[model samples]
Target chain A: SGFRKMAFPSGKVEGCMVQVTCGTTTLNGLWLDDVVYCPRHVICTSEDMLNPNYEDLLIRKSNHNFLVQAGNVQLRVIGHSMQNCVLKLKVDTANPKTPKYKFVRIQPGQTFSVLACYNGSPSGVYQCAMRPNFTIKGSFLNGSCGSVGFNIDYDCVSFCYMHHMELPTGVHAGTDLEGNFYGPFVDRQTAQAAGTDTTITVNVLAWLYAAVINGDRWFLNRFTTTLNDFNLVAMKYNYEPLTQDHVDILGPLSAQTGIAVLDMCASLKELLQNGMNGRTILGSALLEDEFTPFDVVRQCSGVT
Target chain B: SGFRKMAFPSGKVEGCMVQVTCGTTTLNGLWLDDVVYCPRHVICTSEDMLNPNYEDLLIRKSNHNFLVQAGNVQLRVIGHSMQNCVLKLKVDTANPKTPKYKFVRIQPGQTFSVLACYNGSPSGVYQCAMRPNFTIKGSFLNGSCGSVGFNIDYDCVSFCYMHHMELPTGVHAGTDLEGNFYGPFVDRQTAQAAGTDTTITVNVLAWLYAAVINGDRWFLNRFTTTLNDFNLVAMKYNYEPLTQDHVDILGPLSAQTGIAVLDMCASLKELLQNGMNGRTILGSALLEDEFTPFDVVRQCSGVT
Candidate 1:
């Protein structure tokens, strides 16, 4: 579903998603957790970007008694019931980690934008979202509040990590915890069969081997250093320490690296191992290749 | 040293080096002639973190071949006969290039890890060591089966190279092939720090100057388009590239830093000249007690 295909305002948004995180509650409008994915999250437009039905996805047939409406980089929520909730909203940042909480006590049938601009561009709007921390008296369904399907952009580091120095540029074909998916061509064959494109698998291990073999300092180094590198490192969630399996891989090499990264390599391994479950695997390949070497493995990992 | 202490494994490790290769031979150990570093590939341990004899420092008799025993997470190698050798290892996972054979294999000794698994257990280690395409047969003494304080954990990337991202996380703390030392702590009063300390310096000029200034996308993304923000990035090396004078600061910042953060901020013109080394330094201040607020200076650059 492309952004242009949907009629502005009236057309259910095709490429955009109303991503919402209320503590542990995830409310998806169309994609039922029991069935396959629902394509409804694709509902919105940059032009006349507000719509109502897109808002009701959370209201009916679910635990989340709410509605979600969104724009290219903005979102607003209306509680269909008398729900009290506290949420932290971040605007414009690709990774919205910690945003000060903005409480929502909209009686019922009242709507307020959590997506209002206070920073960066007041006009050239970027992505925004809110996590409902203490739901208070209300509820947030168990999936995405948005419809479904479009991919959430991720960093090279978030893209299942990589090789070094070349230009940490590539893709990670996978899914998020919400079950959203990103299908990148793992090899050249897949790309050729698809259309105008190139291929590369986001295989963390493969990239690991290549970081040295292909000398991709571009991709590899991110896991090591700090501030912008490891310091800023994140998962779909947040940062934490490592356990046993993490160190085994660094085996005996990285110590020569540094304190943070040797550890970073171990942490990254877990991220990939986790991200590798299902159509959501780690890889980088050609646009046209034999097949998607990994999704198949992780797909099994994702088998429900 | 280690997570806390400064000791290595008690004995040496042999078969533990899961050695595999797309190559021909496995070079022996010790230091050789053409090298900036003495290739005493020392291994490590996991417990007590560090030990004393382990910290006694690399001073002793000479080498040959003694057996080596290593733990899953650490290893120790001891040399038997007195021997010397030469070798090559790609720097950090960043610029792991084939820099001819700058070899120095010891009779058989060297020691070091923390791959530090913070986020997602940063699984899977990268950074493989290799010699130049041509093998320079030489010798270095053996048996570091773990002892002394040589701080092999340079910039995980420096230990290969990065704060500049040219390498990655870790230190570029002075000390190069010439044994030419840069007193890291250019900004502070420490003068010298040996442990899980910290690091800085070097700002920017061009994406053109960026090659060096931008050092790398290693841990950065200038594409986001911010000024001093994107215009600059970090690294740890000698002044081979910036004509001269630039080294004066290793004379400085790196003093504050812990490595040879080589080139500080160079002027656009000076970037072309011979070391515009002075006020034009790139950095932050945590090393200091008074300042540590950024998202500042670089904020206005975003006005662009």
Candidate 2:
């Protein structure tokens, strides 16, 4: 496929905004539903060296389109066909009840734009889904464009995702999300909240697992912790209430349920003890909350 | 972590010469054992790009003392301590069975030196074990160095190890030694040989698992396959040969006694197949194999 360039407002964010012009032919009948933006950093190893910079950034791509984010601005473009395009944006969160979709529409040759807004919450993850529909004249073929789902997460905490001391050398902490006052410890109230959040995270993770195993094309950033471990504890937490609100709306029950199931299935008491004894738990705590009924649904139906 | 560069001279039949140089002094001992090497490639999007090159590459980490293949001629340096050291090398693979290692010992203030020789079969995954010892006298403490265990597998294969892949990219073709054949279908004999080689590969994998999980250190690329799916297949073939070899080694009576003991205890086949397919014919076949004793082993044990 050909690369589709996106356009975003310049000087509004920390990174560059390159306007995507489809050879002076504005894209028509294209809808830019949602945009997932991730910051791009050019790490420079030596100032004296030519080509001293390397771009360490995040990119999102679907079957037909690609989205690139840097700093606070985002660029969205129309993919092939450019008709009946639908876009849905989902946040990766501990809450499953969050609403997903920040919609927009695009026309031929016109640029669709989005601005990044983080209300003091930590850097987090979000997904963008797009669909484009069009009809070919003369031929009876009506083609619809769909994309492989794309999602990315960034760390926005005061410290990096992990302890600054543990952060790998030469890797800088990206944009910091908002911070919370919760200490390393979790009490009964925090445990209850964690239980609920854990359940939701599990559901989302289950959806991811299915998408991965069954050959549904999708992508998500590595969990906040180590990339290769695949352990639940590696997941980083976005503790801001606003981020949590977004997560509750956009997060999938399957993903949340999957995370909870993994935590509980692995060890319930150990999860609780770790949550209670440690300063902050990164992912879910499904084991400690026996009252949660979502586990049965996930286990029985295997839907998520 | 700094990048560690390793070199492999083309046209040399003895294997490749590998070298690792440290960027910083007094690197972590644990990290030193984490070295691995791979071949890699750098792909350029445009054919006209200034430097579009493809060659056999070597990658190593001086900090972790590891190297891994990237593509045909690409190597990536990983780990936190390999800052500014140089490793040099040549490989002569003329003698496949007994490869040679020629290297100068790394000493203080040494900027460059050869590491080891990688022989046996090319294009397959191999691992080396490092054991170090240390001694202290008066005011000086000398680090201990133990034997570096290098084992190579000639016939190895890997499927799609990533957790997810796009459509039509589900399974990857298998590659054999000498980098000759890399496709899906191998003859039955080749498949059997591959199976045997995989047993040795799995044993090394198990050892690496133990070293990483219990050795109390963080080592990336600890296991060859991340999904652990291949382990099941490897274990099946691993034991199947052992059963046949046991019969050949022990005679029929002893084999029968071994089968009786297996029946009394929990059969490995049954244990492995449990919860997979209980009543299926395949399960039955596995059980039957475990229950049947080798005639030669049984006869030999009778005399004893």
Candidate 3:
């Protein structure tokens, strides 16, 4: 406590220091751990002239982690199948008595059928991915959880893979543990119906490894550390990471959970273009900027 | 308050300029550091106006840091497995689990046994996609502590990849320090038996980047910035970025770990679909929109 702390009612501590607005200011060498040294600078620690942690960073700029993974077919045959047969899959991510594939595949924000594909193909090709991406918000963080959690109503299909089985007619493709019947069909058509339409069985976290392991191993190493401006934000808050969940679209208006998801997005688009100020129609971190309300009224709790 | 000698209120503060609500109000550009002046804008001190700082944003968006790794056939090989094979994968985010392939796979929300593949293969046919994916809720930005520590119970798999092995037969497929046996698997099937189901030795983060890293780097880049609306949200809260942990889904009510990761997606989609007035989710400095939330709901709480 001997060191005097700068009174920066003017700057912010985004874990790392924020770039100050003073003319000619300059901050260099940013590491995730760096904090605002002053409006003019940032630091991890003086002792950490060359951060030991960065060695790990320099060594690891690699990885194939992608926000999206597209496959030739849905079988995701990576290792699942031997021959070349395509497989069928499910997109109906709902709960029911038999849990049948009631809704084929739902579109982007569709809820009815949430199926995907493997090199396990579905609807024809074997494509797969976590559907309905979205953002989170609330009274939490009082509002500081920068970016939050994500959701996967389904586990990754590392190898929602498929096999080009040479099975004979009448021989049932072994039923999934759920006892769903495969075809007695003799052709690839009926034999390979659903692509990624799976039973919800299988715990395969490795699914991601598959998606990432391919393309570029360096892609493997070259990923982000929680050391950027965003990570800095968390650090200021004691390094606690925030998160959010999946959203649904607003369809016909008889909507519940899913529609709420749509409203937020659509609403946000509007808030930035416009701004409501001190109200709860759509609160977002982005509001700090685009908030062009009427008076300087409510502008401060007046200088606090 | 003795620091008052500086001068006039007639000029803009520049650093914390709030978006203007009216049309005739034309002001100067804002420096990243905005503090707020009259009903119009904000600014940094006179000195910051000419700084070399914004130059960086004019430059980077790079990084290296992995969080999790799991693989089956494609082989993320991130120490999580003993076998040295590449596993297949799907970057989609969803959930649910089942111990049985009885679940074969659930649509939208399946759980328990997770599974997957490598480029390892899918669809052989159906290659469809759900565009613009996003998320909102759940808990746990609990996913930080990058190299800070790992749960193994959940760690980010670092080197979870492997050599394709052109050789034949059992070499020491390799023993993990934990003593799991790898193999001389005769074929890809055996090698991929455990897709994401690893020995709990891998650190895994790319598990995500994989989910959304596709379709756009520009999709990535053209994405956000405070010049947009969300930046406002973060600014109001000190411009800190929020984050969330990974989510793990259970058949019943999911737990907080992995799915906090997933929940960010699942719940966020809901949150985005839903909205609160005047704020941003994922607190991006990028307003992406001009926003249009109403003006009087507390609309400018007047004294803000």
For model 2 chain B, where is the 10-residue window of minimal lDDT?
Answer: B131-140
Which residue runs does candidate 3 get wrong by more than 4 Å? Answer: A1-98, A103-109, A112-304, B1-304
Rank order by DockQ, top first?
A: 3, 2, 1
**Model 3, residue A202: C-alpha shift (Å):** 36
- Candidate 1 chain A weakest lDDT stretch, 10 residues: A1-10
Overall lDDT per candidate, in order of appearance = 0.21, 0.21, 0.17
lDDT of 2 by residue, A1-304 (tens): 0000111111112111112112111111111223222211111122312321211211223323333222233344432211111122222212221123222222111112112122211111111111011100000000101111111111110111101000121111111111111122111111211111222233333333333333332233222222122233323332112223323432344353444333322332233224323121111112111111232222223210
TM-score of each: 0.21, 0.21, 0.17
TM-scores of chain B alone in all candidate structures, in the order given: 0.22, 0.21, 0.14
A133 Cα displacement, candidate 1 (Å):
18
Q: What tens digits encode model 3's per-residue C-alpha lDDT throughout A1-304? A: 0000001111011111111111221121100111111110111223442322433322332211101111221111111110112111111121111111111222222111011111111110111221112100111110111111111122211111111122222111211112122233222223333222221100111111121211211112222222243334433423222222221111211131122322233333343334433332111232221111110111111111
True contacts kept of each: 0.00, 0.01, 0.05
Q: List residue ranges in candidate 1 displaced over 4 A.
A: A1-304, B1-203, B206-304
What's the DockQ for every one of the candidates? 0.01, 0.02, 0.03
Candidate 3 CAPRI category:
incorrect
